[model samples]
Structure formats: structure tokens, C-alpha cells
Target: HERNKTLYWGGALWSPPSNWNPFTPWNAVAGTIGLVYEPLFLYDPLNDKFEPWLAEKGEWVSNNEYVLTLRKGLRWQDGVPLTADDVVFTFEIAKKYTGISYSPVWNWLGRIERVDERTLKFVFSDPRYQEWKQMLINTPIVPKHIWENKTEEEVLQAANENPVGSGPYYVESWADDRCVFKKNGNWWGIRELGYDPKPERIVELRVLSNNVAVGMLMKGELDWSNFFLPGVPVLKKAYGIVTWYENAPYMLPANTAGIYINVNKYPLSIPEFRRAMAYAINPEKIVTRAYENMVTAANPAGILPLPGYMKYYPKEVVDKYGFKYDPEMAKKILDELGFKDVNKDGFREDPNGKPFKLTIECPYGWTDWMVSIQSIAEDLVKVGINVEPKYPDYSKYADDLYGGKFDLILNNFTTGVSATIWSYFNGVFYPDAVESEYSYSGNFGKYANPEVETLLDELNRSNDDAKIKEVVAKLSEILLKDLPFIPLWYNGAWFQASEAVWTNWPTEKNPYAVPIGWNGWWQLTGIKTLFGIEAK
Candidate 1:
């Protein structure tokens, strides 16, 4: 039977997993529930702030202690009353199950002490200054009744198939690679005393290949698509199409493209070599010819979206460390290092007579953007640097990166603000005892300095916004001088939509296709506002 009034969207990659369990490998499941299930607290993306969901209010009793007062009568989907026990139970279980991926939330939960049936207190062994506020705002509270007695493996297994949630949408069925969700009629968050429920249903999410998905959108079979092919000029000129564009917030603040040097490797370990390579690259041509002028020249200190967000990032910094397509400067640095082209070959040889060879890794099947890669290689070749392009399968890219197995790799680094510079730098610069597939393999081809580490540590702990900006500026100064990575162009997002089909969708932020807490999804109320639909 055919379903009526369905909204379908396209995805570049297959959906990761759909288990409703919060402890699953796919953390996005918790985010999905926020659409249907209510947490103890919720972050209101509209206001760019946080609000109470299941919990009426929460407060820090001390530096290490936090107390959350529940909303009096919230029940699970199975009619069981949710209490402090459930909150405590989730933390304790997740901590014990160390094999599962660790979350940022666990950083604050030291021990749980329940004052009463409704009131719960958390105690941290270490000073968790920002942990409580961040946790309450982002962590998804799971039901204790369903998960309390399960083993770690069982928890992960259940998450793959059987998801029990207390959110606004419930998984009705899964067929092929698609999932169907129906609005939860008994959802506690919607019926909360002061809140209003928005959508009646979120019909189906179809997992399709990126190219196929784009074709589906052209055919009018898909309502919306999130994946942006780097080659959008061709797509825009296609039959029956309209284009919309916005600068991607995540990549806007930094030169999103760069030749990341592996700090751990040699020859590249020399700061002079890195600087020489950066000078060899023609930034102007990379933007104009390679990208078809789709990109703007990146600031040496990196690109920022708007002025107020990072006012301290100055144009002077870009001017001071900038290299502007100077081949002679590259030759000067190489000549200073001594010995070049004595054999009269195109490539340069070092003083001891060694030809420069470096392997660069990039994602496979991204041949559409191959011209950009070739352009970069040609520039490096002109300066006597040997550039070898290595393409790895998409699935193994992360594995190779984390395993510290490459000379240089093309990847993007992100931070919410300058304050997070410490964690962002640390993950890339230092090797940690606990390794994950996502961990940065220590400065991926650049030299690591102790002073840089100190500044990052200070950046993370400093509460003063002004001081944080100062530290961030200092960090950028060191990075530019060291030339660990050659900053490239920042990427922008291009979207296409039919104004007639939907409205009230969030315009400020790019709504995530899958759930990513409250902020990721389209605000149900906001969607109605755009479409001018009245709630029942």
C-alpha cells in the first residue's frame, strides 16, 4: 500500500544506524530522540541558548556538585515514571562500559547521590568547571527501566534494533535501507505543562548514494537534499533546477583546505622545508582556476565568518605570515638549504643527494575534485618537490589517519570558538594513551612545540573571553611561523529548495539531516511558521 503525505530527503552516505538505545555506537540516535523524546534539559537553537525539558531547573551546589530538580511527573514510553535513578543509572552504565565510545558528558559524572525520588545530585572528583552546564544542555537521558540490567554488549546490540524511546517520534518499521517514524502520541515532553508539540509525523528517511540522491531530487522524488558536490556548477545548469547558497559555518572560520604536514615524519620535520612548500603553492590560481573562482583567498590567520565572533583575528596576522605565489622565494629557501637540480632533472635533490618524495592521502571516488588535487601537485612539482597522490577507500580513511600511517593527508579541523583551540590542537599534536579512530595522529606531519601546547592548555582553562582571544591570536602566530600546515581555501554550502513545499525551517543554522540533539533538527514550531501551518 502507498503512504500519503510523505516527505523524503536524500543522503550522501548510508544512514549509520537507527537503534533508539542511547548507549549505541551511533550517538546520533540520542539526537534523533530529542525530536520525539524529551531530555532533562534542551538547547533552544532559536535563542542560541538552553532550556529545561524533563527537569524544571538545574543548579551547581558546589564546584564539583550539581543538583537537578525533575519536572515532577514525567513517564517513559512504557508508562514507567522516570526519576533521578534513571539518570544515575545511565551514567554508571556508560562509565563501566569503557569499550563503547566515550562521550563528552561522562567527563563530569563522578558519582551519583539521590537525595529523594525526584532530586539527584552529582559529585565530580576533579574540578568540572564547565562540565555540568554542557552535560545538562547536550546529554540525552535514557530510561533506566529498559537498560539498567543489560551488559555492555547487550546494550550495543539492543541499540542496533530495539530502540525504546520517550521522544515525539517512534520507529514504526524498517524496510530495505529506509526507516519509518510515526509521531509519539504519548510523548511526555509534548504534553508537558508549558510546552507545545509541533509535527504530527516525520515520515521516511531514505538512504541513497549521493549521485542517485541528486538525480532523485531533480526527478521530484525527494523533498530536500543536504550533500553538496564540490562540482556544483554542472549541477546548477542541469534541467529543472534552482540553486541556493550559504557559507558553511563550520569551515568559514578557518582556511578549510590545507596541505597538512605530518609532524612525526622527517625532512618535513624541518620547519624550513614546510615554509618553502607553502611558498611554492599558488593560492590565487588554486582559487581562480582550480576551483573555478568558487573560493575566496584564505587569510593566513584563517577565515572568519563575521567580525564580532572572532574580532581578535586580524588582517595584520594574515599579511605578516602570508605567501603569495612566489616561486623565487621557494627557490631561495631551497637554495639556502643547499644543493638543487645538479642532475638537471625537474625535481630537486637535497645536499646529500636525495630526491624529495612525499605521499599525500585523500578520499577515493572523489575524482570530480581531482583537478584541484592535480593543480596543487603541479605547483609543488614546479618548486622541485615530488608530490605523490594516494587515494584510499572511504571506509579505511579514518582508520589510516588514526593509526599514524601516512606522510600527509587532506582533512578539515574545526572548533566552536577560540576557547576550544586547546582540545583541537591537543588531539592533533599529542599522542594519547586512549586512541580512537577519530583521534588526530599527532600534528599529521608538522613539528610539535612545547610552548604551543602550553598556550592551548591556557586557552582551554581561561574563563575570560578577552584573555581567550589573546591566547588564540598567540597560537595562530606560532602556527604561521612554524608553517605546520599550508592554509588553503574555506568551503561554502549550496542548497536548493522549493519554497512552495515547506516553510518555517531554520534559516540561521544548517539543520543536520540526522538528529544531533535539539539543535540539529528543524524546529517543529519553526517549520510550521515557515509553511504557515496551524497546529491541531
Candidate 2:
């Protein structure tokens, strides 16, 4: 076996390998999208630019129409030509299956027209510019000739085990513990992008635990890691592993991880109660202890603290309404709201003297978040608010989260997907907060405000930057005021590369692209790293 030709890593997959179906967003293995399948455009969050992939060029032809021109000489691994019909077929699948994440595109989308063999036009009733752009980078177009013959259920549910894709790599084999992807030498990228990946084969291991992953990293068994190792600085010094940063907070801020409170519940439904709960917990404690100062405490307005996003952070509005770690303020708010210990049981009761206990939840093995939730529980106890930390398996936790069967849960649905704050606000005030038998990702807390909803719609429809900024500011003010979710910390993109095998790994000094190797991030420019790396 040629060790130099193989790239070994683990982080994204926790449970055993399941389906490779790109349509099944939640279950597809890591790299299924960017490695096997490919998106029309690859979004670079750092530069805030979209690099065309499958689509040679995309433009807003009109207020309600977007036109995409596919590159010539593109073919799937099965030797069939990839045409505009394939792209249209991919979107058509979403229209047939409402459960798919991209199905919401149809809410504003009117129809797709195949202008020619290589050109497609998208018409929308009310064009959601930011969301439409997101779909371009995030949605993977499948071959029409292959999937067109499948039944509706098979199209939505089939594993697609022997997947045929048009990307840089294809699934060679997969099992309970790992999946192996072999280089597609005939990939269109070799001709179109003038580049080919260095590694002939990529092996993605199932992440057993952080400790086990740490051992693997130290032993030079893992070349690239997306897992959060507690002592990254120490590992850098002793093992020659490198991260995006050199000093404290040694990673790029990926997303805002916060406590998503269930707004449907009695005390939580009240803004005052939510504000009090936000004041009761200390983010600094979680930042220092749980994250080892690797994470920055999230802004009260819930905007990511990155330079690009800081422009929309309404500092004055946040200063006036933001809830901090103030137990006295929490107690005062509860006192004003008439919550008190009727029998002096130490825990506060509602206005009617009814005791309420809220449970903060996350998956069991997410050590950092688990500790953060524990600290939050302790802090809430100091303010006489009854709360406890709950650890359920990730599968059940996700089911409960989508079902809204949670009191307070840790979530960061908004990631480095787009250049606008609309993505963040979409996570906060998403229109689809309904609980159903099928699972989906969205506003799990069910936070609904007609005013905020109107603002979100306004932000989505407008293409003007000034108008978008103004809408974001207004939304930020409302976000701080309502406290839909308590923004605790900015979760790092969690990338660590070992120089023992692959050279030219992305770094702060030479950041050709973002180095996140997580499941969803592959399509978000994580796959670009492959073009830059060379086997030692």
C-alpha cells in the first residue's frame, strides 16, 4: 500500500457509515457532496466569493430570473454527458420531496427552464437573493439519466451505495468503520480548473471519541482532523500538527453555538423570562473552561465576531438591551415578573407559584458543549432557576430537537455559508418551525414574531447592500431584545493538519482556502484544499 498516496482523517462521522445519497442531507457520509458529488459553485467564506464549479457562469438576468451556464465537456463518472437537464432534474427532486432541505427554494421559485443543452434559467416570484446564492453553492446536481428512472420513494430514500458522481473523487468502498474514496482521473476539474488532487485515495474514519482521535493524531495516523482536541497548542509543539491560527483561539470562527430556548413553553414564551435566563448564565466561564479560550464569546446580537460580519453588529442597540452574566439582574427580572420560591425550596416559581424546570441538552460525547451546558446549569442554579443538563445520544437528540421536544438545546445551524447575516437571522426566525413525524433542521425553538418575520422576508427579497445592512441592523436590535437564543460562543471550524504526510496544508500564513473537513463544509470551499496539498 502506498501510504503517501492516501490521506487519512476523522471527525465528521460519529455513528457507523450509512447512506451515500447526497439528497439525504442528514445521513450522507462526509465528502459525499464535495468529493463524489459537486455543487454548481464553491463559496469561499473568507473572501466572500463564489468560484464556479459545475456552472461556468451564473448571473441575475432580471429581478425574478437567474441564468446559469454549465461548462462544456462535463461528464459523470459513468461516461454520460452532464447537461442542464441534470441540474433541472436535481431541483425537480426537491419540488417532489418537501422534506429535502432545498425544497424551500420552491416557496419563491416559479420554474426552471432548460434554455439549451448547457444553459438553464431559474425564475422566481420573489427572488431571495442570499438564499438563491446559497443554493448554488450548497446544492449538488445529480445526473438526470441515472436518477430520472427512479421512483419517488427511491429518489428520496435510496442509499445510492454504488454512487456515480462527476467530482474529483468517487466512492471506491465503504464499511462500518470507514469509507474510501479513489481519485477520478477523468474528473472534469483536471481540464476545467487545470488541477487534480494530490492524494490518489482518501480514507475517512469514523470518529470514536476525541481521546481516541487525539491518540490517532499524535501517532501520525490521521493526516487531517476536524475534531476539537482540548490541547491543540500542546499538540502543535510536540507533534508538529498545525491549525489556522498560531496563538490563542487557534482556529477560524465557524458558527455561533448557543442555547436555543423553547419559546412555546409558558415562562420561556415571555420575553422577560428569556432575558432573565440569558443573564443567569456566564459565557466567559464556558469560553475559558469548556473551550480553553479557543472560542470567542458570541456577540449579544448573535452575529459572528468575524471582521466581515462585525459591520452588522448594532453595538449601541446591543449595549442597551443585551443580557450579560449578571445574577443580580436575573434575580431582579424574576422578582419584577413575580417569580419567587413559595416554600423556600431554593428554586424560583412562576407568577402563579408553579415551579418549572428546564433541561439543557446536547449529545453525550460533545465534551466541550457538555461542559458548557453544565456550567450554564450551575449558573442558573445560583439565580434560583431550576435547570439541569441532559445528555442523550445524537440520533435521539436530533429527533427531539426537530420535534421541538426540547427545553433548551445547543445548536449552531448558521455556519460560514454566505456573505450576509440573512443566514443567521434565518436560523433564528425560520418560517418552518413546525413539528412533524419527519425530522428537519430549522428554528427548533419555534421563535415567531410577525415583525421579525417581515424583516427577514425584506432582507431576503432585497439585493441592495445598504438596504440589507439596514434590515440586518433592525433584525439585530430585535434579536437582542427577544433573546431567541443565548449566543454563548463561536465554535471553531476545528481544523488541524499534520505535516508528516501531506505538505502545503492551509495555514494562517498561506490560507489558500478554509481547512474545515466537516461534512457540510466540503462544498463550502473545504474541497479546495485538495488542489493545494501535495503528498510528502
Candidate 3:
């Protein structure tokens, strides 16, 4: 590896790039959410709140309209002073296209107007007050100068291979194995605010897999990684490493992982069938077999235990409603539900006497998930169900999961992991309007219950903590019963960073920014990590 301070970042966007136009979610590189653009505000998961970045603070003008105080002297990478005009232009363009990831921002947004050079007014309709925070903070502001003239048709078609961002770095170059970012020396916030500023270059190396990345950081192949390693503690003292935990279970996974049961498929549509399947495959067993006891077994409902989300995850409610890892219960329930071994091939047969087969898919490169599904299939077969563990290419796996093409699949709890808590409700119960565009709705199983929807509808419109908690608890009750997804385990934020490269990189102790492999590397909070990193 070249040693002149080009931090060899790894273990994210391990999949190759589609196109670089980050504005549209389809062909975009994942880093733009953090690297190329700055959100108006940043959600600090470590603190469980939104902190100001681009916008200073929010004051509600009414139930729908909120006024945001803009930070002065913010500039795009091209050195244009960011103004209210740029923000307006960015939102206007987003409104024009129905296909962009932030289309829902426009859909929910009522109107946006500039208050002054460094001030703006945002009026949102049919949104929770918190949703307004997400709308401005999570959405990246596009440049009025470069992209303003591009028509909606042209903008949609444009491949923003060379991204001009107002954040920490600009896209310098990306080859087959890595995408490079050159430090924006002119970055007003980083330089003017006296932060540590970035290196001459920030290189994101698309390493082969988490296993390969484990070795990459060990041998100086990478400066930082979110790939977790087992039996590697002996090496931790010497490597400039920092992780979430002190010992075993090397990471505390805020994001959960689960077997995504496509309820649309045959027999899976039945709640009792799903309940039996949930009881059959053990999450604790998956932890032992696949992750080597490195992860915590997820709560059956996947109702998060975090402070803000914990209210809905009542222990009493869970005990009463939750299914256990009882193989006996699974067998008995399946028998009761009309599944049989009439063919006696050892595998359970459906009511039609057809051997029930569920193909559990994870991407080929995901070694842990591959092992997870294999362990899942093995455990399933022991209970008289034949489960096939399928590994397609990463892209196809994503397509099948989102397009409803698979019978069952593996998804990160953040997939179910984030219910918008994107610290927005990243999409727990998705809205009808939010389709492939901003599919923040994690109801990937296409689970639709009018009761769940009604609860979420109320949950989204109001910010009353008491009412939000009460309504969410009711929603949680329905979710556990339906079992659209069986929460498997909380996947570790899974970050391993070299302190020699950057001392202030987010850690359990520092806790400046939470390390998320997907979007955490590049967001506004993530940039703070880069700015804090010193060559040492």
C-alpha cells in the first residue's frame, strides 16, 4: 500500500459502483450520502438525537411549517457560497423527478422558500415534526450552479461519475478496485471551524469481502475497516484497532439482521405457518454456528431495545406474544396447520403433500450471511423442513429482495434494521406512496395490515412522546403476531479502525460518530471522523 497518508479505507460499498449520480438512488455510489454532500442536520445514533451541521437549528412555525436557520459561508466543492437559493434549487429538482431517492421528501414537503442569504423556510404537509428534521438533514443539497440548468429529463439520465460535493472530499477518481476522494482544502466548515481537515486523498478500496478485509487491515492493506473478525483479539493490541466491545462479541450491533420471509409466496402468507417457521430456526443457533457467538440474538419482534425505541418493546408484551426457539412447538404447530410428512421423505409436506422448500438467499460475497443461511437451512431441515441456502451475486440478491422475487432472504436489521430512525423512522412500515423511491419503508415482506398502517399514520403525524409510545406499542403487538420477519441477530456496526491513522475515529469510548459500514463512512457525521483523523 502507498504510505503517503492516503488512508486505505475498506469494507464498505464492497459491491462495485453502478453510476455516480448520487441524487438518484438507482445508479449512485453509497458514499455520497456522507462524502459528496452534507445534510442540513445529522442524526447522532450514539446520542439518539439530531445535531446541526448545515442548518444551525429548527424552530416550528406551525404544525406543518418549520423554519431552519442556515449556517453561513457553507460552500459547494466548486467554491460557490452555499445559499438559500441552492437549497431551493436542490428541492425543486428533487420535486420534478419521481424516480429519485428523495422523491418522498418532495412528496411530503409542502413548500420551501428562502428567508435570507443564510436562512430558509420549510413547510411540510402530512409529516411528523421529526420527519421535517430528516427531510432537511438527511437530504443532500445539490449545487444550483452546476445542476440547476439541467432539465428534469437530463438530470435523471445524467451519470454523476465526477461528483461535486460540498462536504469533506470531492470525487477525484475511481478505478476498478477503489474510488478516490481528494480533500476539499477550501471546505469552509472543516478549515474555518478549525477541525483536523482531511488528508491529501481519501481512498475507499473495494476489498473482496469481510474476510479479505480482516487481513487487509492486519497487513496495512487498509487503514480502517467495518469488517468484524473472530479469534483476532490477540492481534488487537498491536493493530491500531478500536471496536464497540472490549472482548468477545467484538461489536454491539445496533442494526439487526433477520431471515426475510416473503409472505407473498405460497403457504408463507399464513401467520401460523410463519409462526411455526420462526419457532423452528434458532437465532441463538445462527449466532453459534455462523457468527461464532459474536452477535446478540435479536428479540423475536426485532423491536429495538434502544432508548427511544425501547418503549414499544415491552418485556411483558414480548413474553406474552413472542414465539420461542422450541422445535417441539414448531413440529406440533406445523402438524396442526395441516403440514405433514405424508410422502415421508423426512421433510414436511404442505397441505398438498408437496415437500416444503424455502430457499434462503444471501449474496455470495457475504461470508457471514452465507454461513448464516447454511446454518439456517441445516437447523430448518432438522425440523422436517427442507431449506435451500442460495447465494446469488450481490446485485441479484438485492434485486430479488426488493423486487419480491425470492421466497426468503437475509436482510440486515437496518434493512429491517432501520425503521427510518435513519433516526427518522427510516421505514418500518412503509407508506403506500414510497415505493422503490426512498423505500425507507422496511416492510420488505410487503406486509400490509390496516391496523399497523393506522398506528404508523398517527405515529408519523405527531411528535408527542407519550402518544408516540402508546401507538407504537400497539403497532409492535401486531408486528410480532404477523411475523413478516423473524429477527435473527443484531449485526455489529462492525467497525475496526486504526488509531494510528485517525485517533478520533468513532469508538465506544469516543462515540463521536457511530460506525455504520454502509452510509456512515461518508455522511456529515462521517466527515467529522475524517476531519478528526490525523496522519500520526
Candidate 4:
């Protein structure tokens, strides 16, 4: 390796980073926080295990409590020794004003107690906080020495003009479109843990448009960015680019996306009508036309594709009630439910014999979503359902969606409280549909099922994996039978890199970690990739 090797990466979210505060949530600077702030743990997605980072030791002393032992002799860039005081200060501040993004940890938490300079204990108020491993390890732990006395206003308002950090790298310089991260010689991990990184300096470039970044990648000016190219099939051969896969459907759904149903509307309120709506839309067509055959359809469950969670998927239940685009069956069910076209205008009428139109809404500027909703409208038309596709600006879309202004909309897969099937369903089936704007809070659905609610509660409380699987299977059955929302397509992770600049990135053949383009505390992924790559 050169004495001063460098790596280049493009920021996908924010162009010029605005702040050093990781507490504000998924900002542009948040993705690269591993360069400075250290989390309590790091999860290796490929191995499905947690590797303790800041915490050299982590375990549960009892059902309601967990303990963490920090690595000794660690210090911040300002020369302050790492201690439990920082953990307490960081978490306590977060509980008050951190941000809503990290609320998953704040919600399950009771209080944090510092045992000593090198030790801390978390007393849980909720036993169901079984998934704390995913949260704590990725969250950036700030230093008490720097932020201890900062007021709430300064905490949120500081531009972070001069930053001091404890990770492998620190912010050396920046502008509106670019920034440089210099390797930290005083990093605790490198000295104490014998960590070796390939890049001596990291450069972050900014190009908001994926089209411009694609050209930059081919010219060897940009090494990595997380967005799909419009002409990927030709880019690999013509431009010498590499994505996650070698063939079509290059991007797998990191999570699911579907037609978020408002079951309270007209004929949609009926169970049979809801099931019919599922058979009306075709996911295959969307995968082909909208994504250029570069994406895959999610399973009936529409949740995590992680191997541990996939074990609970019930194929038998899907066989009985799952949908796969049968417009004839859709028509039959609607007719059976009394949704025939009274005016014979090639569209079904409402239960009151009035003109019924299912308006599907999505935000503008999102090309794939625009295509998905439009294609779905056409498919619904084939089943004689009056369907309208509406595109609104992002702000209007959010207000309309949350305010219950539309009948159906396109929304991302939600894994609530935790990343489990029970949590997955909670987004659609929670809070009941009785209180004012009840379904509007958790989801955009109107129907209520006490059975699914009870099941989620039970699954969240159960710590045993075996017991959790049983609950997942039961919830999957209800989802398939009820058809709360139609599973349409997988959301691509949208990661791209240049083989001419760096090799050994995560690919189908090498699933060492998830793509580095993802946000939050994905330092482990970045660490593994940086160490594994041979800089060209």
C-alpha cells in the first residue's frame, strides 16, 4: 500500500455536509460517522452476529437488564479518556432531544446507570426490547468532554466548524460539494485493536443526480455511490461499471414496498373486496417496465429478507391465500361482493351504486414510485375498478397521506419497534380503527383485527427465537388471508462502485456486508469493505 493511499466516495443524501452532530438522524454526514464517532457494537450482517466495538463485553445479567464493559485506555481526539460518563451523557441527551429516528432505542429504554469509568448498565423498562442489539451497536456514541456543557440550542444549532472525533478518521476540510476525511493517528481502535484500513485519506464528492454520478463512475472520477443507473444492463459492458450482481434484477429489495391500502374506503372495507384488489395488480409488470427488469418482487410477507427471519416464512400459508394477478378472480370476487359496474362504463361502482374510483397517490420526483403507481392503476382498470393515479409534490404527498386525503398510496415497508414479522405487521394493523385518525397514525389502513394485535404483543414479549417463529407464522397466515396491503415490489439498495478504483466490494458472490451506500451506523460494513479492498 502507498504511504498515503486514498479512497473516493460520493454522498448520496446531502451534498455538502452541514453538521458534525450524528444525533440529528439520517443526514448526509451521518453515513460516514464511523470515521469519527464509535458505536457500542458493530453487527456483521454476513455472519448474523454482533461484534462488540466500544463495549469489549456485553451481556444480560437478568431479563430486564444488560451490561457493557468499554475497552480500556481509549481516548477522544481531544485527549480525553473514554469513559461511562460519555455513554450516560450521550444517551441521556438523546432521550430528551436527539431526534425521532433513534426513538426505537429511546422507547424501549428505562434508564442508564454508570458502573465505573469502563463500565455501564442499561436497565430496561420493556422486556420486549429484544432487538436492542441492532440499535445500540450502530448509534454513534458522542464524547462527554466535548458535548457535556453544550446547551440544547447549541447542540442542535452548532455548525461543527471545528470537530474533534475518536474514530479512525476526522473531518479535515469541506465545502458545499466536497469534503476530506483524514485518517486519525490517535484513534483508539487502530492502536489498541490492531485495525488496519486501506485508505489513508477519504474524499467525499457530491452529485445529487444519479445520472451524473454514473458518468463520473465510468470515468474513474468517482469510486462509489448508492443509486441505480437508468441503463445498467449496458453500463456494465460499455462503461466498465459493476453493480451488486452480474445479471438482471441487479438490486435486491433491502425492504419491501407495496400499495398501502386504506381499507375504510367504500367497497375496500369489505374483506372479499380487499382480497380482490390484491389479485387486480401485477407485480411482475412493475418489475419489468418500471425497474427495467432490475428488481425482484417481495415475498407474501413483505418483511426482512435476512436469513434468520426468512426461517419463519410460511410457504404453505402463502399457497392458500396469496395473490398473483388473476384479473378474472378479481372480477369474480368484486361481483360476489356486489361491486358490479352499474353504468357499464367499464369500471365497478361503489356499494351505494355511485361512481367509485380508487385513487392511488405517490410523491413526484420519485421516478420508480411514479411508474409503480401508474402501472398499478392500469392493472386495477383491467379488473373493472375505477382507479386514478395522482402525483403530488413531496410535502403535499406527506400531508395528504398522514391526513388521510387519499384512498391508497405507495409507501415503504415499515418494521416497527423491531425488525421482525410481528413488527412488520404492526405498521398496517396497529392502534385499531376506532379513535379519531386511529389508522392514520401507525398506517393508512382502516380495518382492525384484535387477533393480529394480540399476536404482535405476544411476539414482542417473547425472548426465545423458537417462540418468536411460531408467532411470526401465525401473523403471516392472517396477513395472507386478510390482504391488508398488496405486496408489489422490492426497493433496491442502489449501490454502485468502480472496479478500476477499488475491488472486493460486497457482491452476490461476496456477501461480506450490506452495501455501504446505506445510512446510519454502518461502520462495520465500511470497515470490512475498506480492509478487504485493494486500492487501485
Q: What's the TM-score of each model vs. the native?
A: 0.79, 0.94, 0.89, 0.90
lDDT tens digits, residues 196-303, model 2? 888999999987768889888777789999988898877777767788888878888888889888888888889888899888889999988898878888878778
Worst 10 residues of 2 by lDDT: 432-441
lDDT of each: 0.56, 0.84, 0.70, 0.72
Steric collisions counted per model? 16, 0, 20, 0
lDDT tens digits by residue: candidate 1, 95-170: 7787554443466456778888888887766543333444554456778777778887787776445456666666
lDDT minimum window of 10 residues, candidate 1: 512-521
Please tell me which predicted candidate would have the highest lDDT against the true structure. Answer: 2
Q: How does candidate 1 score on lDDT? A: 0.56
Ranking by lDDT: 2, 4, 3, 1
Per-residue error at 422 for model 1, in Å? Answer: 4.7
Model 3 regions more than 4 Å off: 1-4, 13-19, 209-212, 228-240, 351-355, 413-428, 431-441, 499-504
At residue 475, candidate 4 shows an lDDT of 83
Worst 10 residues of 3 by lDDT: 416-425
Task: State in Å the error of residue 358, model 2.
Answer: 2.5
Each candidate's root-mean-square deviation in Å?
5.0, 2.1, 3.3, 3.1
